[PDB]
Amino acid sequence: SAPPQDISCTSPSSTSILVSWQPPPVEKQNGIITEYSIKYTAVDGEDDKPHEILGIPSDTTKYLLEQLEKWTEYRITVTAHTDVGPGPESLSVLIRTNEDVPSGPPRKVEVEAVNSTSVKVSWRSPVPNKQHGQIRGYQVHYVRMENGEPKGQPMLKDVMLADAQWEFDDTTEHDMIISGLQPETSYSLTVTAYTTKGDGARSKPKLVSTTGAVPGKPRLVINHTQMNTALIQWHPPVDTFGPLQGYRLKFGRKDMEPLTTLEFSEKEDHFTATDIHKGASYVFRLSARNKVGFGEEMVKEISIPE
């Protein structure tokens, strides 16, 4: 006898497969067809047991398999029955149900401050058996926090993978800098992965704050003193953003490199520079530091008249 023909399987959802067939050629049948049956088995699935669709009407040539596993392969045959019994089963067809969105978050989310206007976030792909498809990209969500609660509107940055690193994305080490942020401000960051079907589960939010700002520029006062010296005095910036910790002075002949670098504590606010000769130009560059670091340098060049 002849089996069903025109076997056609398609997946309309991540958990379903539409099976289609036609009766065997009537000139090649024997008895009258009375029903169809389907055999379907998840290959490599959580449930590897064969399942069946029974009692399909003789005039019915399509049937929807449902409650299948997401993005999973199924091997399928169709069999025609007569009043005698079942005939030979069709050729075997294997297709995979559709992709879905990831049910797991990106793995290993880590955050850290960069400077006063930016933070860094790192992550890896979701657990492979929770992706439900080829990961196509990620979205980093971040919202400004105030007293432990979100204040501003959330923003996002989308990262889309290139075709070249679809295949090795489980080994790619992902990271992103978010800039354009406010000094000394807390942000709550989440990361999602996406497939073609859409966005998946979000990581558990992680807090990260930008650093504080560095101090403003100090003010320089310069005097010509005896024996080819100059008294270099300074005043702290009014904007220190916390306790000042010291100063850094770079000085020497103008354009002549390298300059001499000296550091001072916050308690010191003058220095006598030596080898300051009449008829030459000298540069002084002074920055102030807090625990974050040094602010911009106040830069002054002086020329001693002859």
62 in a structural domain: yes
Helices vs. strands in the chain: H and E counts, helices first = 0, 24
* Closest to 40 (Cα-Cα) out of 111, 100, 122, 95: 95
DSSP code at position 97:
P
Say if 181 falls within a structural domain. Answer: yes
Residue 274: alpha-carbon gap to chain centroid: 54
Q: Say whether both 233 and 152 belong to one domain.
A: no
> Within a domain: residue 214?
no
Q: Among residues 300, 234, 238, which one has the least CA distance to residue 265?
A: 234
Rounded distance, CA 92 to CA 35, Å?
19
Do residues 52 and 110 share a domain? no
Instruction: Tell me, yes or no, whether 287 lies in a domain.
Output: yes
Buried b (16+ CB within 10 A) or exposed e, 105-143: bbbebebebebbeebbbebbbbeeebbbbebbbbbbbbb
SS3 206: strand
Half-sphere exposure of 52 (CA within 13 A, CB side): 7
Q: Which domain holds residue 37?
A: 5-96
What CA–CA distances, in Å, run from 273 to 224, 260, 268? 10, 10, 14
Q: How many CB atoms lie within 10 A of CB 11?
A: 19
Element (H, E) at 1: none
Identify the three-state secondary structure at position 129. helix
Question: 246 and 282: one domain?
Answer: yes
Q: Using CA atoms, how far apart are residues 97 and 272, in angstroms rounded to an integer?
A: 80
Residue 117 sits at φ, ψ, to 5 deg, of -125, 10
Phi, psi of 130 (to 5 degrees): -115, 10
Report the DSSP beta bridge partners of residue 73. 43, 96
User: Under the phi-then-psi rule, with left for phi > 0, alpha for psi from -120 to 50, and beta for the rest, what region is 71?
Assistant: left
Please indicate, yes or no, whether residues 90 and 123 belong to a single structural domain of this protein. no
Amino acid at 189: L
Domains of the chain: total: 3
Q: Do 202 and 115 have their domain in common?
A: yes
Coil vs helix vs strand at 189: strand
Say if residues 270 and 221 touch (Cβ distance below 8 Å).
no
